[PDB]
Amino acid sequence: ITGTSTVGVGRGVLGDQKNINTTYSTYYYLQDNTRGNGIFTYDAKYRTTLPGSLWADADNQFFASYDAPAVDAHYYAGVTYDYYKNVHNRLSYDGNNAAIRSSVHYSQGYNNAFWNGSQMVYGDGDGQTFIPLSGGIDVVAHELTHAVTDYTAGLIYQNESGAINEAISDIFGTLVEFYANKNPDWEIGEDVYTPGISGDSLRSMSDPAKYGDPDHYSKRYTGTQDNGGVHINSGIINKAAYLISQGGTHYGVSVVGIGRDKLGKIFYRALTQYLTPTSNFSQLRAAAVQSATDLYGSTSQEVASVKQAFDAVGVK
């Protein structure tokens, strides 16, 4: 909408106060004009019609319980935009400052979040398995990264290409979580998963097997559930990424860590210059090796570590 840029204040899902960029025209709307062609947050009103209504508030104060998921979807979309722009020189998900749209309060007791081809969508959770999913910065960045993937490599959402698609979202979800630097870790969804259980998460990149996901290609799932295991086999790639950044010895194979920034550079270049819609795990290894070669040189530690990491997870 047309209006003047303003700054509201509110509380997110975890009870933390933050400022949010809004737009004033009669009401104050969750429309952030400071980033690209805007970030827009919508109320789905417990229904499944999308996007719903652009979020309107009378006083620019967002402290109601019902406001919290909107505050966080809006704010964390901003953080994710900033990560891509500042770290990778990428302007929104399409590289040309496309408007970023999110809807919250999707359906009733809905324990998921997704990119629907055009926008991000967040359930509120059922209060047992999840609380509102936009409360997780890794979750928000995971969803926006699906849009980045779709506009770039275009990895098909099934089998190995789909597991790479998923791992790319977990990797950049995690790198955004580190960028914001509030309780960062290599776990996925811990801030919004199982409020009654401390210390768990949906997936782990550092030890995928903790939650039943494979950490070696020999353990890959090849059945039909979950689009051929896209959220399962992602563990193999997540583990490789974790090893590249942090190092370790896995099934006797030692990897020298090169840190998060270089992990992000290598995978961003692979995603945007080498991967294609049908890339498999072996092709990802080749893309990452080539990306590290471009950035750091064929004789570099970075190239050596990428090879070690894929060796460690059984991908040649």
Ligand SMILES: CC(C)C[C@H](NP(=O)(O)CNC(=O)OCc1ccccc1)C(=O)N[C@@H](Cc1ccccc1)C(=O)O
């Ligand atoms: C980061 C977490 C919180 C959300 C994440 N969601 P996501 O990977 O974006 C869901 N993907 C998805 O819905 O793809 C199907 C689709 C394709 C095209 C258009 C619209 C939808 C996830 O890992 N979902 C998993 C795990 C999960 C979470 C919550 C409930 C059930 C399962 C899944 O869907 O399997």
Ligand SMILES: [Ca+2]
């Ligand atoms: Ca208000």
Ligand SMILES: [Ca+2]
């Ligand atoms: Ca965390």
Ligand SMILES: [Ca+2]
């Ligand atoms: Ca996390």
Ligand SMILES: [Ca+2]
């Ligand atoms: Ca928990």
Ligand SMILES: [Zn+2]
């Ligand atoms: Zn995903």
